[PDB]
Amino acid sequence: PFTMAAYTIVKEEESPIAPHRLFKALVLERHQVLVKAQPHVFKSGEIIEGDGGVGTVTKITFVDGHPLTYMLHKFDEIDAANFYCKYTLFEGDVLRDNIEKVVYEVKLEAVGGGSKGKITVTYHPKPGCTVNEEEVKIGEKKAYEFYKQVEEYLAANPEVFA
Amino acid sequence: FTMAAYTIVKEEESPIAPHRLFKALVLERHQVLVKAQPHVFKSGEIIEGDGGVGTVTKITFVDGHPLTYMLHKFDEIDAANFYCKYTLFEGDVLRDNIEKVVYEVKLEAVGGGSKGKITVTYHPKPGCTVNEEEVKIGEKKAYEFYKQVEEYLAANPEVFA
Amino acid sequence: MAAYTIVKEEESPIAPHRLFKALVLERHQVLVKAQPHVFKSGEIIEGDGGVGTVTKITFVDGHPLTYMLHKFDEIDAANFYCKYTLFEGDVLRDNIEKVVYEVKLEAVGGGSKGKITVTYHPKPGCTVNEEEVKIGEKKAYEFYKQVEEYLAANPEVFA
Amino acid sequence: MAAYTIVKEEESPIAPHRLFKALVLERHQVLVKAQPHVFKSGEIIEGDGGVGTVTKITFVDGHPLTYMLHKFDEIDAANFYCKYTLFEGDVLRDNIEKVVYEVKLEAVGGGSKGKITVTYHPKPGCTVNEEEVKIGEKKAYEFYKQVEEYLAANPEVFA
Amino acid sequence: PFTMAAYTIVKEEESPIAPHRLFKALVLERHQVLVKAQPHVFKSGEIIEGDGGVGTVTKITFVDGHPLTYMLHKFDEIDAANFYCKYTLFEGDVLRDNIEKVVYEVKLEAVGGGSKGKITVTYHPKPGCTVNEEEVKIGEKKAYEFYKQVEEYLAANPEVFA
Amino acid sequence: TMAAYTIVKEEESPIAPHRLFKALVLERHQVLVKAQPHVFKSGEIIEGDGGVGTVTKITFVDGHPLTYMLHKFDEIDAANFYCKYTLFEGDVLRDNIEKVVYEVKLEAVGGGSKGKITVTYHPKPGCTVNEEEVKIGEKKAYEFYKQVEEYLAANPEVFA
Amino acid sequence: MAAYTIVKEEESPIAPHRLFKALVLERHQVLVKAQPHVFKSGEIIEGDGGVGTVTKITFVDGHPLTYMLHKFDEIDAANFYCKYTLFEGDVLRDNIEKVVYEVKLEAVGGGSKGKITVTYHPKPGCTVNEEEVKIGEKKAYEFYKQVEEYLAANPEVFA
Ligand SMILES: O=S(=O)(O)c1cccc2cccc(Nc3ccccc3)c12
Ligand SMILES: O=S(=O)(O)c1cccc2cccc(Nc3ccccc3)c12
Ligand SMILES: O=S(=O)(O)c1cccc2cccc(Nc3ccccc3)c12
Ligand SMILES: O=S(=O)(O)c1cccc2cccc(Nc3ccccc3)c12
Ligand SMILES: O=S(=O)(O)c1cccc2cccc(Nc3ccccc3)c12
Ligand SMILES: O=S(=O)(O)c1cccc2cccc(Nc3ccccc3)c12
Ligand SMILES: O=S(=O)(O)c1cccc2cccc(Nc3ccccc3)c12
Ligand SMILES: O=S(=O)(O)c1cccc2cccc(Nc3ccccc3)c12
Ligand SMILES: O=S(=O)(O)c1cccc2cccc(Nc3ccccc3)c12
Ligand SMILES: O=S(=O)(O)c1cccc2cccc(Nc3ccccc3)c12
Ligand SMILES: O=S(=O)(O)c1cccc2cccc(Nc3ccccc3)c12
Ligand SMILES: O=S(=O)(O)c1cccc2cccc(Nc3ccccc3)c12
Ligand SMILES: O=S(=O)(O)c1cccc2cccc(Nc3ccccc3)c12
Ligand SMILES: O=S(=O)(O)c1cccc2cccc(Nc3ccccc3)c12
Ligand SMILES: O=S(=O)(O)c1cccc2cccc(Nc3ccccc3)c12
Ligand SMILES: O=S(=O)(O)c1cccc2cccc(Nc3ccccc3)c12
Ligand SMILES: O=S(=O)(O)c1cccc2cccc(Nc3ccccc3)c12
Ligand SMILES: O=S(=O)(O)c1cccc2cccc(Nc3ccccc3)c12
Ligand SMILES: O=S(=O)(O)c1cccc2cccc(Nc3ccccc3)c12
Ligand SMILES: O=S(=O)(O)c1cccc2cccc(Nc3ccccc3)c12
Ligand SMILES: O=S(=O)(O)c1cccc2cccc(Nc3ccccc3)c12
Ligand SMILES: O=S(=O)(O)c1cccc2cccc(Nc3ccccc3)c12
Ligand SMILES: O=S(=O)(O)c1cccc2cccc(Nc3ccccc3)c12
Ligand SMILES: O=S(=O)(O)c1cccc2cccc(Nc3ccccc3)c12
Ligand SMILES: O=S(=O)(O)c1cccc2cccc(Nc3ccccc3)c12
Ligand SMILES: O=S(=O)(O)c1cccc2cccc(Nc3ccccc3)c12
Ligand SMILES: O=S(=O)(O)c1cccc2cccc(Nc3ccccc3)c12
Ligand SMILES: O=S(=O)(O)c1cccc2cccc(Nc3ccccc3)c12
Ligand SMILES: O=S(=O)(O)c1cccc2cccc(Nc3ccccc3)c12
Ligand SMILES: O=S(=O)(O)c1cccc2cccc(Nc3ccccc3)c12
């Protein structure tokens, strides 16, 4: 068949945060950060397999009250210096029933005393599924509010990764 | 036909990030030179421009110091992309044989750090020759001062952030 | 807003400079050699094969379709990398504002592999079909097939 | 290391796209059009005609010089911007490694103004014959005035 | 009882010739092309163990009168998809008494109509020997000459190994 | 035409790779001090989290002839127990040495390991490489490895 | 979590070299020779002829099936060992993910022995059929005997 039936989103945003600051906080140490940022949803942040760099995979344990339980992510392609990333989740009740995997691709660029981000995120539908075209704002929505939050903390304390 | 200038093209790496060097070693290079070297630098201030392109700073040296002051104007500033074109265009730092020294700076973010490429051009007055030293001693200073700035910034992460 | 994208993972015996030239750099003039039964003419309207160059491709008189202009956004031929815009043209229906292709081939032994990221965009306050998307793919996929056959049997072409 | 640089401002009655096309884009070719007693051929050997493009300029057999090579670093035929480099040939000799040219034109009336920057890059621990400078400046300024005269007199060319 | 110091040469080069033809010419089907380009020099060249792939042992014949006689090359590693090879010259009179082995690590890239390349050549001495920088420059010039002949021949005939 | 000198070595050990690869690659900068607190004062990563591009700095003891040396992980593949790290800065190079490249490939063998290691000596343009440097360097690196081996054999929890 | 394995010990008076060259290496070419009224062609599309090679098998004008896709996984002609996958064709009949034939011949006297282990894999949600696999062994076994006797007749065949 015309086998190409997948769902991807790409946005760009502007923040007064040196890239290195958002990369560390939203990619390199996201597992650690989501917890400190939304302590009420995340109980633990840790690496299961890896010593940093590519090939390292994350475990994100929710508080024992949250509908969800954990996220599995792994480090695919990392180009440190330019702030480029490809990672994805490959197991955890967070799937919500409409994906085989979720590949997150991000690349940032220094922009004044802040940054520019190009985010490629692909929600992979599965056989006999019609990936929720209404479930789009939501998956995104968790990451944005968490972005807006990491920001403020990062804006408030510049020495944290600068 | 046209008089040749002596050009300095420099490639530099730092652990310090781009908005911070560019802050220190360009716009507030005159102000930071005082904070940076109070045994040589009496005062740094802007005498033309509110801080925008075509701005003219004025740098004066402690009295007993041979040199008196320096004037640089900002040809153009792409602050967004950390580019500046600036020229040293007055003072006895120039002696007689130099008409103007042009500085061209552009940085790039590289991880936690920064890469910086910088040109400097020495325009010799009509007929006179290029004071090779002028450049060497000009190079030594602008840098030695950078190196001082880097240890200070590394040591102080809340400055220019 | 809407973001319904395709993701190709094609691979063929043709060397990548041969396809990068045949399907990216010189597509417009190649579309007429291959399907002289659909296309009358393919040429740049301004530009230097760099970025900001614009091609126009005219369909035969009889054809319901009239024309399309392509504008290169960014290139890097030595790497067989291109992102190109289909902004104006008859074929461009109401629901669609543009379609965007992103090319990056690589060498594989005496041939190549390539991942494509076509991106059919809608016009303010209008929705994107599957049919529409499904046809673009068939057109382009069929074009290459017809071309692969040709670069295969005439190896000097763009070699 | 010590580089010798010539920056200057020039002014022409000739339209800024014609002058650029003639003295940047098609230079390798127009060099041969305006001085057939010096150059026998002018061509591209690497690229389409965009950044990274490499030209070969060959002198007539009887000329002492043999050929020279140039590469484009950046073009932006949109805003008349180019940076190219002379990185091979006997005009370079042993002292000089390469010569980099930055041109930036713009329209003033039916004509133009420009800023050219030539910088002769001497090999490690070598000197640049301040003369090598004065010779380049000359050869080019002459060429530019020849062409300007043809173009003034032949208004349809590159128009 | 320290190891024998082996002499390593690292070269980077370029050809407008495409890398599949150049790998074929200068790696895969070398033993035969040596014979096409310099017949005044080489009599024959063959496969006498292996299927082209890894483990292959090639034997190349000098002309009768040539002061050199024979050489066996063994293919240590072959990844023909990525233009990457590693093979060994171990058997032959070209090997001065003072030389145990010459190992070649080749890796080409694609650049437009042609290629970019990195070649590693290490000459391994025999027990308690001084590699004569003589022989080093010797083969090295030989094989670059060869590089230049072939390149010129290919640029001439675009189908060969196309 | 300007050469470099390379020592190619194949090794065996009763320690398992993953353990060896952590002792003698990643945390080599640290352990060196553990192993030889009389030669080294510290071992630290200036730049990186541990990945391609990561650089480390190792400091010698006050009395020792040397001062420092930093290494660059040009390539890593902890999954395959392969690495490529270069010594590019330090007194240890004299004036003669441009850089030293370390290429390691370890391989599980029963409860043990076999390691394939190359060490390439690249000289400063125009300068030579004197075996003196490369006999003294192989030996140092290897003595260290035998100390480590002992310790980890007698300490099964360490880098388990 | 299912798969139909089948281990058969066989013995023959043909030396293991020829047997390896006739029911493994050149089979596909040999099937048309012995059973021509059943076959058209055996060839390669993307294979060296050694480890990692592929083959394809075409019957005659009407035969139900069309062609068989056999890869090569692990070869060692020296020790007359071979694995060859069968993942495409229409003999898979919607049940067969693949069929993995695994051979290993050894010289005995002037003849040979053989441990043959065919295999039939199931695509998730497919029935691991009973008598179908029974035709597998039948086809092959029967050929072997035709071949076996042929190599007796013409002994110089395949040295
Ligand atoms: O710690 S917290 O103040 O809770 C914290 C709270 C909220 C947002 C944060 C964002 C980035 C880094 C933090 N700290 C951090 C701490 C340890 C390692 C890395 C980052 C943030
Ligand atoms: O987006 S994340 O930034 O990882 C994220 C950030 C912050 C809180 C989150 C809570 C639940 C699920 C996530 N992921 C998720 C993913 C897809 C759909 C719905 C939720 C959360
Ligand atoms: O917020 S989102 O784009 O949704 C976002 C979504 C998912 C992953 C992200 C990773 C880094 C930065 C983001 N945002 C960002 C925003 C402004 C400036 C810089 C980075 C990410
Ligand atoms: O960013 S937040 O408001 O935090 C936010 C939190 C949670 C879900 C969101 C979904 C869409 C847009 C948001 N931002 C937004 C901001 C301003 C106006 C409209 C939407 C969402
Ligand atoms: O202006 S800077 O290089 O910033 C500079 C920075 C710091 C200290 C300096 C001392 C003397 C002269 C300078 N300039 C100079 C310029 C041209 C010729 C000779 C000296 C110094
Ligand atoms: O475009 S092709 O599909 O190969 C093609 C298809 C059909 C007919 C063609 C006739 C001539 C040249 C072609 N190609 C060609 C391409 C580039 C340069 C010169 C000729 C033809
Ligand atoms: O428009 S063209 O007809 O080619 C053209 C014609 C004549 C002179 C030109 C000079 C500069 C750029 C052009 N074009 C261009 C177009 C698009 C992008 C960049 C440059 C010129
Ligand atoms: O393939 S499509 O055009 O999508 C197509 C879609 C639906 C029905 C079609 C019927 C005939 C020919 C087609 N193609 C065609 C294309 C170009 C010229 C002439 C006919 C049809
Ligand atoms: O530009 S291509 O798709 O490559 C293309 C290639 C070959 C033939 C085509 C014929 C008609 C329309 C196209 N574009 C088109 C685009 C979107 C939807 C439907 C048709 C054709
Ligand atoms: O046209 S159809 O067969 O309707 C078609 C149907 C379904 C999927 C297709 C995918 C690609 C190309 C098509 N056409 C095609 C035509 C000729 C050669 C190669 C592909 C597809
Ligand atoms: O795949 S196609 O469907 O023809 C295709 C469809 C749409 C756009 C394409 C652009 C470039 C190359 C293609 N093909 C390609 C084929 C083989 C290798 C590399 C690229 C494109
Ligand atoms: O005169 S040239 O200035 O070289 C010249 C300059 C610029 C553009 C030209 C275009 C056509 C012919 C020329 N010359 C020419 C010369 C001899 C015979 C025919 C044409 C052009
Ligand atoms: O070089 S050429 O010989 O035109 C060439 C010929 C044929 C196919 C090519 C494909 C890509 C790039 C080229 N050149 C190129 C050169 C420099 C920069 C970018 C592309 C190709
Ligand atoms: O090679 S020439 O074409 O003359 C030449 C061409 C252009 C620039 C030159 C600059 C210096 C010396 C040359 N030659 C030279 C020749 C003899 C004696 C001294 C200098 C130059
Ligand atoms: O450039 S030179 O002749 O070498 C030169 C050298 C010294 C002084 C000159 C004064 C005017 C014109 C020149 N040249 C000139 C050359 C060609 C045409 C017209 C004038 C002068
Ligand atoms: O390419 S041009 O300068 O414009 C050039 C233009 C016209 C005629 C020239 C004759 C000789 C050398 C050139 N180049 C040259 C370059 C460097 C030094 C000396 C001469 C000539
Ligand atoms: O002739 S020169 O300036 O020497 C010259 C030297 C080298 C490259 C040039 C390219 C374009 C125009 C020139 N002249 C020019 C003159 C007037 C207006 C704009 C450009 C060039
Ligand atoms: O003993 S030796 O006789 O020199 C000797 C003789 C022959 C082979 C040897 C190999 C390794 C180490 C030795 N000696 C050694 C001595 C002291 C400490 C460490 C190693 C060897
Ligand atoms: O043509 S030859 O004259 O033997 C020849 C001459 C010189 C260099 C050659 C290099 C590679 C292949 C050849 N021949 C070749 C011929 C047919 C197919 C493949 C390679 C070369
Ligand atoms: O290098 S080869 O490419 O095989 C080679 C290629 C072409 C001609 C050769 C002639 C003599 C010796 C070789 N090899 C050789 C090797 C090592 C040391 C000395 C000579 C020749
Ligand atoms: O000529 S050499 O570099 O010596 C060379 C020496 C020995 C083996 C070689 C194998 C392939 C290509 C070469 N050269 C090459 C040159 C430029 C680009 C790609 C490959 C080989
Ligand atoms: O090898 S040759 O075969 O004479 C040769 C042939 C063809 C082109 C050459 C270009 C540059 C240098 C050569 N020789 C060369 C010789 C020694 C050192 C560096 C280059 C070239
Ligand atoms: O530091 S440990 O982590 O145990 C350690 C880890 C790995 C290897 C070690 C080798 C020698 C000594 C250690 N410790 C040691 C401690 C005190 C005095 C002397 C040696 C080693
Ligand atoms: O400390 S050592 O380990 O020997 C040492 C090892 C490796 C490299 C050295 C370089 C310079 C001096 C050292 N010390 C030195 C001591 C005496 C004579 C010569 C050099 C070096
Ligand atoms: O760095 S290591 O080999 O790990 C090393 C480990 C342990 C002790 C060392 C003492 C001196 C020099 C080293 N390096 C060295 C490097 C090159 C030449 C000579 C000595 C030492
Ligand atoms: O020759 S034939 O008589 O066609 C022949 C006919 C019928 C069955 C055969 C079976 C195996 C080999 C043959 N011959 C063969 C000949 C040469 C090479 C390989 C196989 C068979
Ligand atoms: O069998 S024979 O026919 O004599 C025979 C035929 C062909 C080749 C033979 C090779 C070795 C031994 C035989 N004798 C032998 C004896 C007992 C068992 C197996 C082989 C050979
Ligand atoms: O077994 S094969 O050796 O390929 C085979 C060998 C000889 C003749 C065959 C005829 C038909 C089908 C086959 N394969 C087949 C396989 C499984 C089930 C049914 C038929 C034949
Ligand atoms: O068992 S058969 O059914 O012919 C058979 C069926 C399918 C594949 C076979 C592959 C090799 C050898 C066979 N037979 C064989 C027979 C005697 C000795 C050695 C091998 C194969
Ligand atoms: O296909 S059968 O119809 O069964 C068959 C029936 C009668 C005679 C046969 C002779 C050889 C092979 C067969 N194949 C074969 C395969 C396995 C076991 C027994 C025979 C023969």
Residue numbers in the entry:
A (entry chain A), E (entry chain h): -2 to 159
B (entry chain i): -1 to 159
C (entry chain B), D (entry chain j), G (entry chain D): 1 to 159
F (entry chain g): 0 to 159
Would you copy out the relevant sentences from the publication that reported this structure?
PR-10 refers to a multi-gene family of plant-specific pathogenesis-related proteins of class 10 that are differentially expressed by plants under stressful conditions such as drought, salinity or pathogen invasion. After much debate in the literature about the biological function of these abundant proteins, a consensus seems to be converging on their role in the binding and transport of metabolic mediators such as phytohormones, lipids or flavonoids. Such a ‘molecular container’ view is consistent with the canonical PR-10 fold, which is built around an internal void (cavity) formed by a seven-stranded antiparallel β-sheet curved in a gripping shape around a long C-terminal helix α3. The Hyp-1 protein is important in this context because it has a unique set of three ligand-binding sites consisting of two internal but separated chambers (sites 1 and 2) and a pocket formed by a deep surface invagination (site 3).
When crystallized in the additional presence of melatonin, the Hyp-1–ANS complex formed crystals with a different pattern of structure modulation, in which the supercell shows a ninefold expansion of c, manifested in the diffraction pattern by a wave of reflection-intensity modulation with crests at l = 9n and l = 9n ± 4. Despite complicated tetartohedral twinning, the structure has been successfully determined and refined to 2.3 Å resolution using a description in a ninefold-expanded supercell, with 36 independent Hyp-1 chains and 156 ANS ligands populating the three internal (95 ligands) and five interstitial (61 ligands) binding sites. A similar association is observed in the present structure, where dimers are created by antiparallel association of the β1 strands of adjacent protein molecules. The characteristic zigzag pattern of the two columns in the unit cell is the result of the noncrystallographic 21/9 screw-axis operation, which combines an ∼180° rotation with an ∼1/18 translation along the screw axis in the direction. In Hyp-1 this internal cavity is divided into two distinct chambers, 1 and 2, with a separating partition (Arg27) and separate entrances, E1 and E2, respectively. Stabilization of ligand molecules in chamber 1 occurs mainly through hydrogen-bond formation between Arg27 and the sulfonate group of ANS. Site 3 is created by stacking interactions, with the ligand molecule held in place between the jaws (Tyr150 from helix α3 and Lys33 from helix α2) of a molecular vise. The ANS ligands in the superficial sites 4, 5 and 6 concatenate adjacent protein chains into a unique helical pattern. Furthermore, other buffer-solution molecules (sulfate, HEPES, citrate and dimethyl sulfoxide) were found in the structure at selected ligand-binding sites that are typically reserved for ANS.
